[PDB]
Design a protein around this ligand. Structure first.
Ligand code: DGP
Length: 70
């Protein structure tokens, strides 16, 4: 009995992360098009899944990177 039960059904960013987890991508660089909510979504999901999540840059250069190494 292990996994995620609190499913969002189908989530854009959660779909991006689940692909990322099984992909060659050691780090998933998201576009600056993500707003606070979009990032919050990613931070939440990555935190629950167990991956490293951080936003780098500034604001006009602010992007979020998810890493498989956590
Ligand atoms: N759960 C969680 N949320 C985070 C973390 N860091 C930032 N957030 C949230 C706070 C903000 O509402 C949202 C996006 O804002 P930003 O900190 O600019 O990425 O992400 C974190 O480490 N864990």
């Amino acid at each position: 009995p292990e996994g995620v039960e609190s499913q969002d059904g189908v989530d854009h960013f959660r779909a991006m992360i689940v692909e990322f987890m099984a992909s060659k991508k050691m780090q998933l660089e998201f576009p600056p098009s993500l707003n606070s909510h979009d990032r919050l979504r990613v931070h939440q999901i990555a935190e629950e899944h167990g991956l490293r999540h951080d936003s780098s840059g500034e604001g006009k250069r602010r992007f979020i990177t998810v890493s498989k190494r956590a």
